[PDB]
């Protein structure tokens, strides 16, 4: 086993304008990991949802990456190492890049980004499947007034 920190991005935007946040592993087990699925939500009322990609700890991303955007406001991500060894995630980093967009008529203020369902974190210590558990730091968009351009010495 036995713990690692999956990270969700504090990030900043302007209402109207679109917003990059990353999904960070750290302190991920010498050992590795050989699979994982959770789901995020977020305020789908607030932001669009523009996509998902998949970070670069992730070897071979198009064999051993998913995400599901269907249910509106939730997010799922799974990660599975196909090869059951040689594509492991072996090293903390960005797991994935959300692109949203802060729709026009949302009002200033904090769009909070959560865990939301846990499924299994695991990896092959010895080839044994081993457990992880998963700790997560919850982020957000803080959505803020643009300063104007435009301005005067008065």
């Known amino acids: 086993m036995y713990w690692m920190n999956v990270v969700i991005g504090k990030m900043n935007a302007e209402v109207g304008g679109e917003v990059v946040v990353p999904i960070e592993f750290n302190n991920v087990p010498s050992f590795g990991i050989n ?15 523009k996509n998902v990609e998949a970070g670069d ?35 903390g980093g960005v797991f994935a890049k959300i692109t949203f967009k802060v729709k026009s008529t949302t009002a200033t203020g904090v769009y909070d980004l959560r865990k939301d369902l846990v499924g299994s974190f695991s990896g092959l210590k010895d080839n044994k499947m081993t457990s992880i558990g998963a700790e997560f730091t919850n982020g957000s968009i803080t959505v803020a007034a643009t300063a104007p351009l435009e301005h005067h010495h008065h």
Not at 35 to 49: H, I, R, S
Not at 61 to 70: E, G, I, Q, R
């Open 57 to 91: 700890i992730i070897k071979t991303p198009l064999a051993n990456f998913s995400n599901n955007k269907s249910e509106e406001g939730k997010i799922s991500f799974l990660f599975n190492d196909a090869s059951q060894g040689s594509m492991q995630i072996e090293n």
């Open 35 to 49: 699979n994982c699925d959770f789901k995020l939500v977020y305020d789908a009322t607030a932001l669009e949802l």
